[PDB]
Amino acid sequence: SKYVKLNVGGSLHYTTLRTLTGQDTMLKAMFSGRVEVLTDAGGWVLIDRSGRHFGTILNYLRDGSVPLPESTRELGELLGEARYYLVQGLIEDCQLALQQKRET
Ligand SMILES: [Cl-]
């Protein structure tokens, strides 16, 4: 029940530590002391990424699955972040959803 507050490109998020370390992701690396992380005076963990889909990322780490968006752009936007945070399961789902739109 240890909590964490993240500032993802101006997007403010509150989440638990277990969620951030529940899967083998780059976020798990941050909150286990394997990579240098920057924090402001407010105690917010700063991340230089768009937080547009970050809530969706947290849902995947938390629940293990999430309903994906419909448009090819948003799937692309989500896929980009899933790749940045190294969330293997979500990247695959986004890839399958994208190839399904290509058919056709
Ligand atoms: Cl579309």
Author numbering: 40 to 143
Show sentences the authors wrote.
The human KCTD family contains 25 soluble proteins that share a conserved potassium (K+) Channel Tetramerization Domain (a subtype of ‘BTB domain’) at their N-termini and have variable C-termini. The BTB fold of the Kv and KCTD families has a roughly pyramidal wedge shape and consists of five α-helices and a single β-sheet made from three β-strands. Here, we present novel X-ray crystal structures of the BTB domains of a further five members of the KCTD family and examine the stoichiometry and stability of their multimeric assemblies in solution. Overall, the pyramidal wedge shape of the KCTD family BTB domain creates a versatile scaffold compatible with a range of oligomeric assemblies and geometries that may impact function.
Our crystal structures of KCTD10 and KCTD13 represent the first structures of family members from clade C. Unexpectedly, both proteins crystallized as two-fold symmetric tetramers revealing a different complex architecture to other KCTD families characterized to date. These structures were also notably distinct from the four-fold rotationally symmetric tetramer of the Kv4.3 BTB domain. A second interface is additionally evident in the tetrameric structures of KCTD10 and KCTD13 as visualized by an antiparallel arrangement of two β1–β2 hairpins. Interestingly, KCTD10 and KCTD13 also exhibited retention times and MALS scattering that were consistent with mixtures of monomers and dimers, indicating that these crystallographic tetramers were not stable in solution at lower protein concentrations (<50 µM monomer concentration compared with ∼750 µM used in SAXS experiments). However, KCTD10 and KCTD13 were both dissociated in solution at lower protein concentrations, demonstrating that their BTB domain interfaces were weak, as also apparent for SHKBP1. A rather different architecture might be expected for the BTB domain of KCTD13, which crystallized as a two-fold symmetric tetramer. This protein was prone to aggregation and produced a heterogeneous sample upon mixing with Cul3. SAXS experiments using this sample produced a scattering curve fitting the same 5 : 5 heterodecamer structural model as the KCTD17-Cul3 and SHKBP1-Cul3 complexes.
